Amino acid sequence: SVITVGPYLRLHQCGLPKKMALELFKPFIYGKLELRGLATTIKAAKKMVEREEAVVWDILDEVIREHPVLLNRAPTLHRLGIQAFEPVLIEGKAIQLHPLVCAAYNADFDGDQMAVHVPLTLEAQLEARALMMSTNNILSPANGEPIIVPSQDVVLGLYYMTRDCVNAKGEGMVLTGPKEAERLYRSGLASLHARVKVRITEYEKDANGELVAKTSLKDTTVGRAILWMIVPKGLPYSIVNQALGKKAISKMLNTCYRILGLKPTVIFADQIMYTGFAYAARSGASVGIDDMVIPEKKHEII
Amino acid sequence: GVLKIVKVYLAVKRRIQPGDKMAGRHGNKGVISKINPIEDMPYDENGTPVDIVLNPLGVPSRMNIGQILETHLGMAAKGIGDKINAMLKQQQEVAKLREFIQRAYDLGADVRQKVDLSTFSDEEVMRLAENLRKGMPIATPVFDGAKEAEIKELLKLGDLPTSGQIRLYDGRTGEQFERPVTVGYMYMLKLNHLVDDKMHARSTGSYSLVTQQPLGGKAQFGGQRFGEMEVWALEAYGAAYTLQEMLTVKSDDVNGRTKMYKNIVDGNHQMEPGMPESFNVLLKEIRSLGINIELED
Amino acid sequence: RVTVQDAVEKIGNRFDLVLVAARRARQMQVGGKDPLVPEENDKTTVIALREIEEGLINNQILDVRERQEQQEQEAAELQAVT
């Protein structure tokens, strides 16, 4: 079916419609229905799901739960074009696909289609969870570069968030933590980019596997403290102290993967995507006809 | 050898849903992704919600800057239409309608139109305003179109802001979006690549005759082709049982798949592999030549 | 369940993980053995990997338990005969 976005997803799960889910999982639903004792012969179960009564949707949510599926975009070129997700059921008729994963599939949303495949046997469910799961493919096999790099909206939300301007609301005030930085942004007393001394507590792990806390006052902005609320423990503050374009957020996720491993990098990739979408929505970053500024010197050059 | 032909015409009414394809007239495609409620829409300081929220980031890379000029000129057209609706809903006499429609039809440089309403005789002007109240249509020929200053002067005739950008509030939080955003009217088309014509699913359907594999297509209730590059992409992982059931149990081997169906409806979750029957077809086609292919041991 | 990283930290091959967890899930599903960790109505695959993460199951312990519970069956048969 045709794909669509659904940005509420965690990156190990994808949205899958109820009609496709009841068609692809007919034998598991038959086995579940025969186990409970609701029906007797197989025919009765096929009439039940042909009618789609009120009790087979609970059966369907109990066959989905921990059963991965293989999503596949139709021109598969490398191995990151078949990835295994966990379904989340969708009122609708379109596969909801987590956005970061799109940069692996070369999948935009201009009319694309993807195929779902079901691992039937038990070794195949374990291969989908342990080799082909989308959390397991965060580095491209051609090199060392991360393939779950945040693509387009989220880097605009970050670049508007962690930046600065020479005067805003709350210029040069002092803040006792990142929590009241977000509280000053939400209440309407400061701006998202307004330079400010905060007190942040960065955890540097300089010992042999022991995280040592160092707390200090960084001359930073409001947005850099709000984005510091999402960074895991081990990374230093200077990973967010700059302006965070796309190369900088890619090496942010890369340094998180090299230091803190896989699980903080998966949960931190999701928190990056969520905060990028949220502050890009709050940014209101349009495009106008006045934004393309003609040089005044252009006509004399011609 | 046919007795009678009965033809029946069903008439479906397909509305809209997440998954259809809409597009403007400049290449801005898109799968509609969420059909929001009315309240969540960004509204402005008049009260009206916006209908569709596009994405700005498609403009500087995909260089179709014409859609933003079309958006601003559409907002100018609807501003003139709203002023006609205001001057007509208050039951005003035809003199003020004649004044305003004449000012909205002159408005430019040396142009081709040059109309005058002094030869419409007080009844056509009311019916012309009955047709203009949902907006005023504007022609813009291809390479001799409306420049920027004419769009600005027409946005000044309505009481809209000059830059085309209204500040917009939020529907969820109820608090203002910073840095005022671009609204207007774009003329968007629904394309007939719908989503309840592409969506398909198959547990177990019919099987082909010469090679015991599932049929192809949607009208024939068929399964999706697990092609060659996907086989390469599963060799590229270490997924070995997934590929074995992906090309022996789920696809070809008939005794294997009936054993599989009994094992799935009994909770077992186990495959008895066997051989693809299409490999036996390969043996019969190579063997039907003078070639003697076998299976040793 | 999201990641299987520690299940590879305790079985370093990442392919032997699939064999050990498949053997364990086949013992729990059809053979009717109790899980050694209390579940939360998870499926048998996640309970297998959840036993791998505790460390109380790998291929060594599975061979030990299959040899001892095969010797127990044959010992019960021999003491029933003689």
């Binding site: 070794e123 | 060799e235 270490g238 997924a239 070995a240 049982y241 | 392919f15 064999l19």
Partner: peptide, 16 residues
């Protein structure tokens, strides 16, 4: 004989 099946092919190549 590469992925998960390399143990199976080790077993089959050992048992000849």
């Amino acid at each position: 004989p590469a992925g998960t099946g390399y143990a199976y092919h080790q077993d089959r190549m050992r048992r000849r």
